[PDB]
């Protein structure tokens, strides 16, 4: 017994036990076929499939495989035996959460389950019930305003660009220096270059002029090979894309502007709170200088009076999971579980 907390990312599954400080298992959400293995098993190495796309479960057959692997290989538990909290993307379709609900009770016979919005849990992890969360993972980015513990669904903004797009973009620009990163395999090296070497510029156009006239921004990187490669402005051009999605041909506003737009969609009386509680969460908020660049940008948009505060925990690639672990630990929460019995009596609708 004791509740399980599973965070279904487009990129990584975070799974474990409620009460723990950290997820017990963290594995790529991929299923590898012939040419059937899930996760790390599939990493070696032949068609990789991602069942979650932009935060939305999209291949159900394969998601079942991910869930099964999660219970029976990673967590080593019997699902019939623990309440399970699953996370979903903001604005997840209704039919989808109905399907996730039915799979739980019907394929896995969980005794009980719950479905939380990722971003809400991030907020909880920081000790807040009020805040606007920027959550930027591998598959999608969202602004979610939350007041007194409720997400405000009308004010949620979605940027369909995130860590994966940024890697792909880094592969593209890395070619200007003569480097070729092309395949699936090579793209994983690039993901690594991204996580180690990229950063957000405080003032983009000045970062560029510095890169142009000086080699002070250059950093080098050892490959497998291990050939050493050097990069410069590609370090910050890459994540700059979050402020400027036109870099990769997109029409969307950048994360600073969606944050603003999201706050403007909310009642004027709660905005001060939002501005004072900007929680960043997700792997793609890890870039150095990203906090600083938001503060500067949101400050240029907000009332001149307004207190702006960016909150960026060091554990924020795992905030979501940690929020579910806290939530599902709570004594008071224990009544929130949708139970098998409730399910037999109402079917999948219960989940709303």
């Amino acid at each position: 017994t004791t509740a399980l907390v599973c965070d279904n990312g487009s990129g990584l599954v975070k799974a474990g036990f409620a009460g723990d400080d950290a997820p017990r298992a963290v594995f790529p959400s991929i299923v590898g076929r012939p040419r059937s293995y899930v996760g790390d098993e599939a990493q070696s190495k032949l068609t990789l499939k991602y069942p979650i796309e932009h935060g939305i479960i999209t291949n159900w057959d394969d998601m079942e495989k991910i869930w099964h692997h999660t219970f029976y290989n990673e967590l080593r538990v019997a699902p019939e035996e623990h309440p399970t909290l699953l996370t979903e993307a903001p604005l997840n379709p209704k039919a989808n959460r109905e399907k996730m609900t039915q799979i739980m009770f019907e394929t896995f016979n969980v005794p009980a389950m719950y479905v939380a919005i990722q971003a809400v849990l991030s907020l909880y992890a920081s000790g807040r019930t009020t805040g606007i969360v920027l959550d930027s993972g591998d598959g999608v980015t969202h602004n979610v305003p939350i007041y007194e513990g409720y997400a405000l669904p009308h004010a949620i903004m979605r940027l369909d660009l995130a860590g994966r797009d940024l890697t792909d973009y880094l592969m593209k620009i890395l070619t200007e220096r003569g480097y070729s990163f092309v395949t699936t395999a090579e793209r994983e090296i690039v993901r690594d270059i991204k996580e180690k070497l990229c950063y957000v510029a405080l003032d983009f156009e000045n970062e560029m002029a510095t890169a142009a006239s000086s080699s002070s921004l250059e950093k080098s990187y050892e490959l497998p090979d291990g050939q050493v490669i050097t990069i410069g402005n590609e370090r910050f051009r890459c994540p700059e894309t979050l402020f400027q999605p036109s870099f990769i041909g997109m029409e969307s506003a950048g994360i600073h502007e969606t944050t603003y737009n999201s706050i403007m969609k909310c009642d004027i009386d709660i905005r001060k709170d939002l501005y004072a509680n900007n929680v960043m969460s997700g792997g793609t908020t890890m870039y150095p200088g990203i906090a600083d660049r938001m503060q500067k940008e949101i400050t240029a948009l907000a009332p001149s009076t307004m207190k702006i505060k960016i909150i960026a925990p060091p554990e924020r690639k795992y905030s979501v999971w940690i929020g579910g672990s806290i939530l599902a630990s709570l004594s008071t929460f224990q009544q929130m579980w949708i139970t098998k019995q409730e399910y037999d009596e109402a079917g999948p609708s219960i989940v709303h």
């Binding site: 909880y124 992890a125 000790g127 019930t129 409720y150 009642d267 008071t332």
Partner: peptide, 28 residues
């Protein structure tokens, strides 16, 4: 720990209180 969270969750207003306040849209 975030025992802090638990205190804030009991202090929270009802969804209904918020719909009334003009903060939350209802939900059809």
């Amino acid at each position: 720990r975030k025992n802090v969270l638990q205190l804030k969750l009991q202090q929270r207003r009802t969804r209904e209180e918020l719909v009334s306040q003009g903060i939350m849209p209802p939900l059809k």
